[PDB]
Amino acid sequence: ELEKDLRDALQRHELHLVYQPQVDYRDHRVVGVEALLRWQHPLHGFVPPDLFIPLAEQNGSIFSIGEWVLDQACRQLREWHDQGFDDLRMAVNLSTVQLHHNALPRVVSNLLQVYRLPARSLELEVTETGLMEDISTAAQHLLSLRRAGALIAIDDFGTGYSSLSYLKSLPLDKIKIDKSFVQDLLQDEDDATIVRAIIQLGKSLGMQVIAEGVETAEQEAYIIAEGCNEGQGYLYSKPLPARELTQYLKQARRL
């Protein structure tokens, strides 16, 4: 039922990473890339991450998959840095189980040393739900990750529960607006209100804000006018395999 086929997946080389660029609106430059895990099974097609990551969390294999993801993402960043894009950031999502695994600080610190990555070049994305299960342990691990040189961002912001007390207290550097609000920006005006509110909440707390799911130039124009710092989504590029994002990044940085 693929909850059984998931187990062979990494062994069968059925998992891979795709990469989505992130654009800074101060200079409209590509400044970061988000690594996204895919499972393309030869019989079933792509299996949604929202399906199989819960599966991996329940059978205790998510930490081993996450180790593989982090290694491949850090290696890919080192390759891109060596090609001249040495200010590029790499962002990697951490599932809730990973976030609360006490070996996560060691795994990340190892990779930052092994690939000799600059400070502030790896960003770890966590969700509001991940933080809420056990804010005590999450805070300890996030502080340790920041101490090792990683940045921390909150993914899918606005879809979970957050405490403003903890948002300012934690070592959080960036808020990512959930794409559900950005995608329907120009249509629903409660969605636009929440987009504007998240932007201003990031500004009020001294955090960068990135809009996910930017599909159209008119959406980009609206969020830039309201003060958003960065963007991600189809307007810039869908998620791409590494070889194709290398071409996109060289083309984007050419001029």
Next chain:
Amino acid sequence: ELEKDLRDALQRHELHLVYQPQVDYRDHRVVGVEALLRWQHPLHGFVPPDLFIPLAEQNGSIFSIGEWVLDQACRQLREWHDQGFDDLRMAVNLSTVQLHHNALPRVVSNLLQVYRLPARSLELEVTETGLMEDISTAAQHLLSLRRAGALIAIDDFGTGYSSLSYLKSLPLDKIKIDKSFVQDLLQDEDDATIVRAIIQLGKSLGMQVIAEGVETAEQEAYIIAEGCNEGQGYLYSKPLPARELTQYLKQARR
């Protein structure tokens, strides 16, 4: 013995209300009053509400106590309206267990009609913790309360967990900055950041913002500059018994 004593505090008339005024910064005029429950035990003295309301929620006394508070508060609003303070609003705190009780909409609607109170004159204060206890039930009770003519405010904001999604979709009118962030305002700069953020979150979402715990004129100047709409705290008045708050209202509207 404390939980035991609270079981019958209400027949023993050991509960009373005090009232704290609220000031609108658009014209620096008293626009509302918060009713606050007190329990002065004959042997123990004042028992903190943070102590006896969780006790009332476990032992089931909260329902009858809460109904008594709303009744006394609506009665006092009717008296002040008839004394010429026609537009005054009354604010009452609802505990989590109260907020999720099936009979809460009928209790509030009864009192609004019994005391012939105008629409938007009673404001019910709920906490983020109360909303997150069961967002489905909370949402339908809040919609019924608003449908009956009550206003809804989130009390102690910033100290619990909220969702921007639900803040916008619920029938909320007002956010109350938690007193702990305002008391630390001028000396502590991270709480100044939280205060600024809450005020701006309120503007962004189209909700009024009231600061609780305002103690000095410099704090008030800071929060108005930031866009705060209302204030409450020792700077205006500490909580007062009804006869002194009447004196306070009369003194101002001279």
